[model samples]
Target chain A: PGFQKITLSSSSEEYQKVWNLFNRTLPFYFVQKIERVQNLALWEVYQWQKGQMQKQNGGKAVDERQLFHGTSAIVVDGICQHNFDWRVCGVHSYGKGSYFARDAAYSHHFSKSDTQTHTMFLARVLVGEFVRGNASFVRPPAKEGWSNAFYDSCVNSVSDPSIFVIFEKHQVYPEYVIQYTTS
Target chain B: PGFQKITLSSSSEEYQKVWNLFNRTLPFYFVQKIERVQNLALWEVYQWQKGQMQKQNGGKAVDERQLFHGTSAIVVDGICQHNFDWRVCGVHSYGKGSYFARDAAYSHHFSKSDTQTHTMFLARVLVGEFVRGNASFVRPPAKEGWSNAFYDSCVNSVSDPSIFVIFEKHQVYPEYVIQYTTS
Candidate 1:
């Protein structure tokens, strides 16, 4: 009835990426389906934030990367529809913001799949000038310069990081849904 | 700032349709752009309800339509992102529901655009079996029978509906944003 779900070919690169994310779990996991989410509205909001950052950073390219977020089947559709709502997002161990993991393994624990098949997202994030995150980071801390304005995102450490925390909703775009099974 | 602002070619059929809506004020109006909105997320919600109606009506064709709704620019982005949140919508004159107009003239007055370039929406509504709306209608009264469940939508009059009011958020999709000039 709607164009919400676009199936990627099982052997396609897109599907391969989804499958590879869980490659470590290998024999225990079977990638059932991978579908690209098409939410132009949320993407526009993301683009709007990028443009805003560019203006403030003197046309500098915002640091961006793809990350994983695990959640149960119940809220996956709404997440793709409205993107993430920070008001209801409870994970704040690293910081008071949306949590995105650099590896699929880290995100896997957060998922409480209602069925045998688990659903999670591959999100594009704007990791612009992140600082070390702490539990008290109600917002990304002030940058070193530029009149001490807020940083866009945060990570666990400067030298090495596995988590990227986003303070703004516009900085993340939920692009795909990966549904997989565990033995 | 984003690709959301898709410019329509002036004199295009879409542009003409936008202009004709305010044809009564012909001497002072000009359509600048009639951009087709792409909010597949909220649209999915709308389609889900449409499918639900089809199931209930034994595959009967849902009386779906495009209607006008005028509002300030501040809320336009959010409406596209999350569809309409009926709770915040204050218009309850016809009924305690989100309001839409059959005519552009009716909607134009409701709009309070901030800038010279005014914006309004052409929303697609699912007008299932409707009943006449009144101020007391906090909810659409139950339909003619199946143990008094509910009607899908409501209008100013079942006889000749110029005003459509929606109680359910899923029944509507804000599809096109009409940005135009007003003298």
Candidate 2:
């Protein structure tokens, strides 16, 4: 039991950011409810991971974006409550990593339902240094030459990537749960 | 995102309390580590459930106890991180509920391993208005007449309950993760 005020009203610039993101990509879903999450446990871990990312990236940029991840209601409930556990994540189509979508429509397919409502997450993703993803990757493939380090994440395509894939669970933080229905 | 400051040093009264409880129980295991939990999300839900218990009981005693539950390494990792999810808990031996032990030895059996280490939980339990448990019970039996109420929890026995069973997940709060080894 590691939470305080879990749900908050969608009446701020943060909410506006998610709404605008959703509006820009796959605007077919009419948003009925948008709930902001403030999981202290998850946030502290996220901040800690951010620090680690900064240290690992060295002078490299820590590029962050609010990306979308779509799932069913039960999973939406679990991730919003407990954060994403990459250890338990499915699919290696892009790579064996947590998948986040640049386009809301892309995630909408995962969260797609014939039911009354569908749920998706607007999550903060650390898409640090990246490369094209391969199905066999556990982490972004090692950089060339003497160094033993690898890239932070991978993408389906560099020029026109719809989804960004992160190898580590801590690299992504689910910020908002958006519930909507298609007309 | 459930907890804030998860691990605490095994000093002070709180730690002492857990130590004393383990001492009172079978006490064969050499306690290797004792880590405290502080998941904000879990605590909020626990507090809320406590309030609901108080309202339902209405002048009835809210008997609380520090109990133990034994499990494997991975589950110990999940519980200390996310708290209990009764819906996902295994076993219905004493009733379809989350089982907690009065004697740490009973739980210790579940935590038993031939490996290098094992894990168990020292948890806070709301044992309010309990009855002798039955294998058929979903919740404590419904109160008779038009009152339309049920007991809060159930147990193996009234006179000598080794384990307390609670139908709802929120009724228990995992406060400590105790890692140990047998002699």
Candidate 3:
């Protein structure tokens, strides 16, 4: 019903490489059956990456968005076709208040978005909050700038639009500070 | 994940067939994955009855209750250990309803339990109800020439105690019956 193991180590490039392997290989070997062709598309990404990596070259440029999309699809397929239960990892905003020990109130957060509806819309709001708060990306202005501020700034800027609407709708104050406070 | 394959048929004979194989083979096949031992118990029962006839053989009778208990242990272990999702199909009744459609009003009527809890309880209740209502070995009715009526009388005499006390304090009925409607 839940994953046997979930590791939340630093998401550095070094870790991402290992995660890429885990994200790709486990399903490739263990998925005994699939009900639909789309269910296997994520495996195709892994297969492609495997071949690309073996060409005696630097690692292929991974599209984070595509990786996110494929991973989310695999999760949905696992639930729908494979009968895999979906349990939110502490990293996902869904576990924020209850399991993750974060000050923020958790809500339905989008781990991926191509599938849009009312659910997805709400998920987008949560995702924005997660990235702006739970994720280790952005920090408050009062804090000294770290070398990775570029990364933080990028993540924060990217998430701002979706989250701003949610904040504005609720008449939340000190929008930027609230995000940090919630985190 | 739920199984995806040609399901085995069901019957007393089929149940016995798989029961023997399961006990003999599981220890050897899943020595390390302790979880599989439990799942195999129920899976073998399900496989045996996938598409088979429900004829009974009086010879070499195994305690069907014991077999069901073993299968049920597997289902509960699956939920507790997060191994697999379980679904049940059956009918039962208390003092109020006869041959009650347990499936339709299942989670609704018994809002005290979860899918895991409800199925486990229902398995025992159904077996008890069956034995009380159908077993020929039971004593005849107190009134003469009312053997068949005895079973119904037994069923009616039994009380429909609240099977859902766990969720009663939390008012979890809305979550339980959210998908149901009175027919």
- Name the best candidate (by DockQ): 2
After superposition, which runs of candidate 2 have C-alpha atoms over 4 Å from their true positions?
A4-11, A59-61, A112-114, B1-183
Task: Tell me the number of clashing residue pairs for each predicted model.
Answer: 0, 13, 9
Q: lDDT per residue, candidate 2, A3-78, as tens digits?
A: 4334545677766777889989767668877777777778888788888878887745587888898876655656
Local distance difference test, per candidate? 0.76, 0.75, 0.24
In model 2, the Cα lDDT at residue B148 comes to 74
**Predicted candidate 1 versus true structure: per-residue lDDT over B42-87, tens digit per residue:** 7788899999998888899888988888766655766776676554
lDDT of 3 by residue, B33-145 (tens): 11112234444443343212122222322212211112222223233222222111112222222122223223223322222322211221211222133333222234346
User: DockQ for all models, in order?
Assistant: 0.02, 0.03, 0.02
Per-residue lDDT, model 2, residue A32, is 78
lDDT of 2 by residue, B1-183 (tens): 555435556777877777778767757668777788887777788888888888877745588888898876645556755666554423426687788898777887777454968778888988887778877776788765637788888987777777898888788888888777877
Of candidate 1 chain B, the 10-residue stretch with the lowest lDDT total is B84-93
Docking class of 3: incorrect
Which 10-residue span in candidate 1 chain A carries the lowest summed lDDT?
A84-93
